[PDB]
Design a protein around this ligand. Structure first.
Ligand code: ZN
Length: 257
């Protein structure tokens, strides 16, 4: 049902998913003039050395690069987090134009795309249980701008032809998500939600300040994906982003001065 089209986009989601109008919805605009440095944040720890990618899937809204999350292979800890969060998948949101595509915004600026590395809190045993908890997930968000190519993204780009349409998957082993990180791990953090239905308010968001650069050709290949299934009318998978939601009774904290 829901999507990013003319008649089922974000402004409609509340009908089936009333938390869309909830108190802790994501994404949000990050106002760098009101986010306050929090000296209590602990150091943030990205431990991806043992990550095991498995597969890439076009799910009809984005594509997910999936990982083995049956052991502590690729974990996020530190920062605002208590305990250990295991990487389950990453995916992106992107635009039809280089001036839009991100979900979070920074002083109202939209980036060309946004990467979400999704992790679940191991204290809840599995992802499906974790999403029912306010501290169930930690999502590392990374902005993409168009400029230089990102060499560590090219393996993703090159497999997209094999998953053009909804429901297609491909083997995708030995991919290193460290190749998608910027140099700095400085971040903003706030409590929020999944940005797609069911929009559950289970996420500690960790949004990196430093964007990564991807080339025009890399983003153009994202924009060749399809929302539709094979044999259905072609609808390019573009503008698969939810706009900023009201901050309400939340504060955004910065890890850096
Ligand atoms: Zn996302």
């Amino acid at each position: 049902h829901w999507g990013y089209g003319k008649h089922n986009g974000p402004e409609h989601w509340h009908k089936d998913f009333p938390i869309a109008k909830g108190e802790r919805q994501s994404p949000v605009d990050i106002d760098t003039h009101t986010a306050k440095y929090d000296p209590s944040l602990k150091p943030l720890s990205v431990s991806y050395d043992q990550a095991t990618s498995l597969r890439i899937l076009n799910n009809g809204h984005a594509f997910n690069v999936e990982f083995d999350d049956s052991q502590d292979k690729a974990v996020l800890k530190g920062g605002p987090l208590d305990g250990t969060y295991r990487l389950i998948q990453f995916h992106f949101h992107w635009g039809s134009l280089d001036g839009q595509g991100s979900e979070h915004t920074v002083d109202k600026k939209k980036y060309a795309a946004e990467l979400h590395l999704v992790h679940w809190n191991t204290k809840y045993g599995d992802f499906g249980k974790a999403v029912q908890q306010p501290d169930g997930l930690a999502v590392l968000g990374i902005f993409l701008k168009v400029g230089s190519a990102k060499p560590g993204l090219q393996k993703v780009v090159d497999v997209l032809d094999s998953i053009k349409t909804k429901g297609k998957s491909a083997d995708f082993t030995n991919f290193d998500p460290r190749g998608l990180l910027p140099e700095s791990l400085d971040y903003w953090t706030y409590p929020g939600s999944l940005t797609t239905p069911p929009l559950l308010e289970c996420v500690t968001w960790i949004v990196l300040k430093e964007p990564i650069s991807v080339s025009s050709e890399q983003v153009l290949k994202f924009r060749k994906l399809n929302f539709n299934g094979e044999g259905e009318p072609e609808e390019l998978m573009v503008d698969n982003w939810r706009p900023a939601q009201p901050l309400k009774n939340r504060q955004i904290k910065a890890s850096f001065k």
